Amino acid sequence: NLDIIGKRIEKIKQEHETSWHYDQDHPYKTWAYHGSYETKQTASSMVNGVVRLLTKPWDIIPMVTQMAMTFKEKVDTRTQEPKEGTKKLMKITAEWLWKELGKKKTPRMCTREEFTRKVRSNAALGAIFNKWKSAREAVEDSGFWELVDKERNLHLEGKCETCVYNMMSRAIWYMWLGARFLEFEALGFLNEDHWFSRENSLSGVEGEGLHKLGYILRDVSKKEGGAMYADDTAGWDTRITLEDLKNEEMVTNHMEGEHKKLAEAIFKLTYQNKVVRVQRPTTVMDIISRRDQRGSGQVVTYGLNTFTNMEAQLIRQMEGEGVFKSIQHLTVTEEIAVKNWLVRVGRERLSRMAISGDDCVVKPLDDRFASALTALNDMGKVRKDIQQWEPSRGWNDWTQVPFCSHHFHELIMKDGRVLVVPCRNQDELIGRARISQGAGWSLRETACLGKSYAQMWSLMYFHRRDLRLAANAICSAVPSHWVPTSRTTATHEWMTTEDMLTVWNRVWIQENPWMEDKTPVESWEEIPYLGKREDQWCGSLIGLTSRATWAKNIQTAINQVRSLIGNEEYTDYMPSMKRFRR
Numbered sequence: 001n002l003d004i005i006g007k008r009i010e011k012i013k014q015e016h017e018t019s020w021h022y023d024q025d026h027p028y029k030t031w032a033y034h035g036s037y038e039t040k041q042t043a044s045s046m047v048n049g050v051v052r053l054l055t056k057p058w059d060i061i062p063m064v065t066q067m068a069m070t071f072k073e074k075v076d077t078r079t080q081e082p083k084e085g086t087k088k089l090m091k092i093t094a095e096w097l098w099k100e101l102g103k104k105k106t107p108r109m110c111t112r113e114e115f116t117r118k119v120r121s122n123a124a125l126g127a128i129f130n131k132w133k134s135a136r137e138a139v140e141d142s143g144f145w146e147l148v149d150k151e152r153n154l155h156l157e158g159k160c161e162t163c164v165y166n167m168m169s170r171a172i173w174y175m176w177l178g179a180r181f182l183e184f185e186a187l188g189f190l191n192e193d194h195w196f197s198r199e200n201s202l203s204g205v206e207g208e209g210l211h212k213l214g215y216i217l218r219d220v221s222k223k224e225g226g227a228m229y230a231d232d233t234a235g236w237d238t239r240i241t242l243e244d245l246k247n248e249e250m251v252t253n254h255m256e257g258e259h260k261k262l263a264e265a266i267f268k269l270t271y272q273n274k275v276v277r278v279q280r281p282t283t284v285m286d287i288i289s290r291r292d293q294r295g296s297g298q299v300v301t302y303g304l305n306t307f308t309n310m311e312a313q314l315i316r317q318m319e320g321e322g323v324f325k326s327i328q329h330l331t332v333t334e335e336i337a338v339k340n341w342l343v344r345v346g347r348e349r350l351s352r353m354a355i356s357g358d359d360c361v362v363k364p365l366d367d368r369f370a371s372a373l374t375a376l377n378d379m380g381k382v383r384k385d386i387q388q389w390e391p392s393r394g395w396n397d398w399t400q401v402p403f404c405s406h407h408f409h410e411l412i413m414k415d416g417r418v419l420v421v422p423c424r425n426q427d428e429l430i431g432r433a434r435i436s437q438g439a440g441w442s443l444r445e446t447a448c449l450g451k452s453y454a455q456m457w458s459l460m461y462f463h464r465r466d467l468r469l470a471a472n473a474i475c476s477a478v479p480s481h482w483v484p485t486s487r488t489t490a491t492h493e494w495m496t497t498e499d500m501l502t503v504w505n506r507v508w509i510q511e512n513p514w515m516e517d518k519t520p521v522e523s524w525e526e527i528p529y530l531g532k533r534e535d536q537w538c539g540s541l542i543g544l545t546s547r548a549t550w551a552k553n554i555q556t557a558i559n560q561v562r563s564l565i566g567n568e569e570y571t572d573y574m575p576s577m578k579r580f581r582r
């Protein structure tokens with residue numbers, strides 16, 4: 001308690017000595033509440049006019065138009081301490097899983113240099129504005145780094161002063177850039193050296209890319225076993241127990257020297273104890289603390305979520321195989337048997353899973369997994385939208401399984417080669433491309449974001465008739481040489497000015513390890529669509545009057561956006577399609 005957080009609290013109290021007050025009508029039950037002080041401030045989603053003017057039929061689809069308008073009663077919940085049998089299962093599995101991840105990897109500190117290059121090329125590192133303006137500025141000023149140095153030597157002492165969370169089914173805890181550096185210094189290796197790559201972790205898909213996920217699920221399908229299970233957790237970050245935070249910290253057991261102590265301090269002082277500032281309109285700033293739940297860099301969050309999810313799903317698999325009888329208490333011979341299962345089949349059981357943070361797909365040995373619920377519920381990883389003790393509904397077809405907001409189609413090219421393509425409801429795809437985050441967008445920057453979406457659609461969603469046409473129209477309407485941009489940057493092969501047919505050939509043919517014949521595709525017309533009926537099932541407007549008029553008159557929409565942008569160099573991409581090829 002206050003021995004570890006007091007200093008951080010004491011320091012904030014002093015910066016607001018003219019305001020401090022222990023409010024008696026504080027809404028916190030599960031969060032500890034320490035006091036309040038005076039503030040006054042708020043970021044809404046804006047429409048991209050380039051994308052909207054080239055997708056007119058969707059102006060009347062409420063699923064699209066509603067996305068652009070606009071649970072903190074889940075963060076103030078509490079999760080029970082697992083039973084002893086659960087606690088033992090988790091420690092043994094965690095110990096074994098860190099060893100496995102570490103067999104071909106070396107933990108190591110990430111560098112000021114590495115950190116600097118990151119900020120000088122926009123990765124969403126969730127920092128805050130206030131002594132400097134942008135993050136780009138603070139990284140060049142050597143004053144900053146003295147602040148970093150001060151805190152860093154404080155962490156080696158086992159104390160913390162400036163590492164304080166700022167809270168904003170989503171909640172994003174920004175820290176000041178310096179606190180983000182110290183987190184990145186200690187744990188960045190997990191992301192930077194790909195600890196959750198499929199090759200290294202067997203279950204993971206870090207760095208895989210949307211054009212690989214389908215092929216990965218198809219490979220899991222090829223295993224002998226039961227249904228494929230894809231249970232989402234209800235508010236995963238709110239269900240991370242102090243016992244989970246402690247099993248995560250065991251990665252420090254693989255470290256040394258300074259690194260080991262820096263990592264230990266990040267775990268002890270920012271993860272297993274937290275200080276947070278929250279806005280309350282009643283607008284003051286509440287300073288509250290707690291020990292448990294997830295609150296870290298969104299990137300260290302991803303990796304530790306993958307880790308703990310891998311762990312939970314191996315244990316749920318153990319329960320289905322009757323490796324242990326009861327979560328109440330493991331016997332001495334039950335521990336040997338758990339350890340022995342891990343040594344004997346653990347790697348095989350990891351390969352039976354695709355895990356992306358809180359998202360999983362499991363193909364267990366058989367369907368006993370479906371009703372193996374005691375460990376999963378006792379770890380606090382309670383399934384969304386099913387009664388606590390109701391058996392999981394499995395999927396019988398890998399092409400129906402949900403994963404990372406997608407499903408996957410098998411699509412046979414006119415030459416017999418097999419593409420596995422990602423897909424989702426086209427209303428979702430169009431509604432997201434029509435949205436921009438932030439203010440101060442020039443027409444030119446708005447147009448280059450539109451173009452990033454168009455090139456993504458050409459690479460990932462080429463098989464959707466409406467998105468290949470809209471993508472061709474956007475790339476026709478935006479100057480040929482203007483570079484695609486994004487403000488909150490998987491593998492993003494569409495972020496390039498290279499020819500999209502050439503990138504398609506690289507991604508789907510040349511670099512695709514599931515394609516034996518490497519014959520390049522010579523034109524876009526060799527590249528197939530879904531069946532007409534499947535395209536409509538997944539949200540196509542093909543067959544509507546509105547869509548027929550849009551398609552037929554597309555050159556008039558393209559010309560409207562060209563006229564707005566002005567007299568620039570443009571390419572006509574519409575003759576890459578058969579119907580416009582005269």
Ligand SMILES: Cc1ccc(CCNc2ccccc2)cn1
Binds near residue numbers: 532533542543
């Ligand atoms: C470029 C293009 C493609 C298809 C169509 C017609 C789709 N009609 C249909 C009927 C019943 C089930 C599914 C589709 C029009 N334009």
Ligand SMILES: [Zn+2]
Binds near residue numbers: 155159161162
């Ligand atoms: Zn600190």
Ligand SMILES: [Zn+2]
Binds near residue numbers: 424
């Ligand atoms: Zn689909």
